[PDB]
Amino acid sequence: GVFNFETETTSVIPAARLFKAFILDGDNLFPKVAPQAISSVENIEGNGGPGTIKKISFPEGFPFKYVKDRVDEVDHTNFKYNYSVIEGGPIGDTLEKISNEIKIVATPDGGSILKISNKYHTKGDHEVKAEQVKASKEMGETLLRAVESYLLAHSDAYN
Template sequence: MGAITYEMEVTSSIPPAKMFKAFVLDVDNLIPKVLPQAIKCVEIIEGDGGPGTIKKINFGEGSQFNYVKHWIDSLDKENFTYCYTIIEGDALMDNLESIYYEVKLVASPDGGSICKNISKYHTKGDIQITEDQIKAGKEKAMGMFKAIEAYLLANPDAY
């Protein structure tokens, strides 16, 4: 099994605590409202929402995939970090064992936040994944982040 690591940073004018609450803690409720074509619903299969929880994300009509299952590795509300692993689903295609994500929100000098994301793609056998496949995943993640940011800007009293 091989592993490919990819790092990405996205800036936001929303402070880290507010963005973390929306983007991590309440994302299961918020994203189906904000992007229903992307995510239809999220179900907790096992656990209480903290580490060890397994969630099933059902994609919307606009997605090429049906679902994925996430395992929550860690959740640190004080330091705004969240780690999870995609462990099952057709989004892994037939060439990935799992994808590990580490998300950290930090304050930016302008009062907003910087979302730092590390993704580790664990491939099956000696299968290689392309830069285009990684780029497509990066663009979807950035689109979700920016959609939540837009929602928070349009609804300043939310969260």
């Protein structure tokens, strides 16, 4: 079955720039700006669009060793990005995939709002509980703030 979770968060970075950096250039940025969160990102196959598979490895001591994420859809006009966690980490005999949707919208003050949906597709009769969702939110927030700090400090990056 499916467990649906949603959250929103804010950024001080304008939407288009944040989408170009945080969403479209994570493979480069996350290990650079948040090395204590992400040890590496490997592109396994594909050229960036639907179907691209990346292997995201976590540092030693983290709960999970890695996940593989698959890009589902990329909307450059509306700053929407869909991807799924398809292997590793929590994926296995209790959990088939986690499908995610991110949308970034501009705010009049020159920042943005990120709207995030996470849909857990379980196998069998298993509950997706609060702690698991909190950890994913914490990871996302950490990555966002690290990219935000980098973009504030490197004004010529991603214009």
